Design a protein around this nucleic acid. Sequence first.
DNA 1: CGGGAATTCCC
DNA 2: CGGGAATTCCC
Lengths: 313, 279
Amino acid sequence: DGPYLQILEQPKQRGFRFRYVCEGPSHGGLPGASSEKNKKSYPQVKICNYVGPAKVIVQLVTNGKNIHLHAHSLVGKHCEDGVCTVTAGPKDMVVGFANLGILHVTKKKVFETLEARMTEACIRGYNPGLLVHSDLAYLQAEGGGDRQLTDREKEIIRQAAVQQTKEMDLSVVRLMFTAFLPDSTGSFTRRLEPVVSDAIYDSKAPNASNLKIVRMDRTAGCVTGGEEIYLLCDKVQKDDIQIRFYEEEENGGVWEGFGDFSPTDVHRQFAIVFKTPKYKDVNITKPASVFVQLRRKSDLETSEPKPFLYYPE
Amino acid sequence: CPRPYLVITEQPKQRGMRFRYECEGRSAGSILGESSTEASKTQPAIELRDCGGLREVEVTACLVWKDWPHRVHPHSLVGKDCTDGVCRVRLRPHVSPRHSFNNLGIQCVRKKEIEAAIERKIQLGIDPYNAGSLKNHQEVDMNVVRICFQASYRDQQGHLHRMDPILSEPVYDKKSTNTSELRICRINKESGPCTGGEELYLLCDKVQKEDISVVFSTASWEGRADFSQADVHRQIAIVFKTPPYEDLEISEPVTVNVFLQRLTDGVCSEPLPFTYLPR
DNA sequence: CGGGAATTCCC
DNA sequence: CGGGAATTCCC
């Protein structure tokens, strides 16, 4: 009911490359679920119930039940150290994040990055038990920025920088927006409750990229199934992919069938040679208007439906 | 006047061998012979000629570049009696067929790894032809090396003799795509007319969209189907329109086997049975 | 081993 | 300123 942050347009979620360090960050800008063909739309948030000037920062937090710092790093203009700090609020309380880049540390150089991230955080506020170990907090900002601290603790983060690297999934990340209002002296120290964005999956992750049925062989087969068809497609994991044919019979249900193929019938992750399934009704003579779509058993992500035709005997 | 010498009585399978990185150690797939063929696996061998009178010879297999400047090659032959890029085997004729190097294997380095290794090589005194000291690195092919055999022997008094170096048929890496043996896994259909313009899918192995072609063969015939690079899906599935056959209207179909062929070095797959039909 | 995931390099 | 593909590392 008082001053609070809020996400306006969430990040896209799927279809963006976490360009590696060696690739050079200068590769693209993370969009918002909307950024369409001829109408971009970046991730923007608005401070609500407050109209004075502010400071809104963003960093990458892990995904899942726990919420810690991610080893990856945001990159861009007003960014640095994987945390972009845009200001905004003189009169307009909405702020967006254009040309946002997502690093991607090597599975190897993670720990060091974390340990360094955690510790450096063990000197300020919001970053204490919320981040590193929920058994500290004794930090939550003192008055001047205490020094490196003593051992044991200097070993508690290290021990946490470990348990965390182990469970960090570098193929997904969430943006964490944190607004800071000005508390006297004009300075920004009034830190509003943060807000996490949706998951953002690395399009270079075989397990979570967009699905696409790029031109396939036959656009129709006999209702007797067993029709062997060649399908060209974007990267898939033979063991977790499936070809779902389906029909939406008039408010009576929803038909669905799946093609046949051994994880061997998937060719180098881009082609799948399968046999079509028996339609819903075989004795019929009139051709069938059905839809086919690749699908991930894991996340249930589904490609665009391509029209398919079932013709009788 | 006869002088002892060695010869490659069997070159190493020019294509099909995959190179391994330090981080993979050894493997169950070693270097093969030109002949070979899954039924009669052969190994790359040599032989010593006019060597009687030589109680014992010593041969040393060690990769070297490939062209004119035959500097020691970065990678290294790994396997039996080796150690560094140099498989050694002492020999006494009264046999002399030179086994044929059985498990022999190549262990590639990393594009950065070069300079060092190649340098640590001469530093270690390994160079079948001697390179130089001023800059031993420019454009090196990590996909094509070449085995160089050598032999030497003593005589009455230690003084050893070195019988001229013998190069081998160029060996190519199976992963360097542009340098691997092409193959056709499956193929859309094998029926089809004779006119042409019949869309035929073709699931092949790794191949570059800007250097691949498929040609149907016949009696000294070679018609290649058309298709744009936009048809080659992620180098694993070439899709094409069927070409016409040497102007025919005959009702009796015939075998017009097809196959992948590289525009770069002409190399090509093993033909795949496909026959036309009438109009 | 050979297929793929992880990281690069290249246009 | 994206995307394809080559190089390495891993299972």
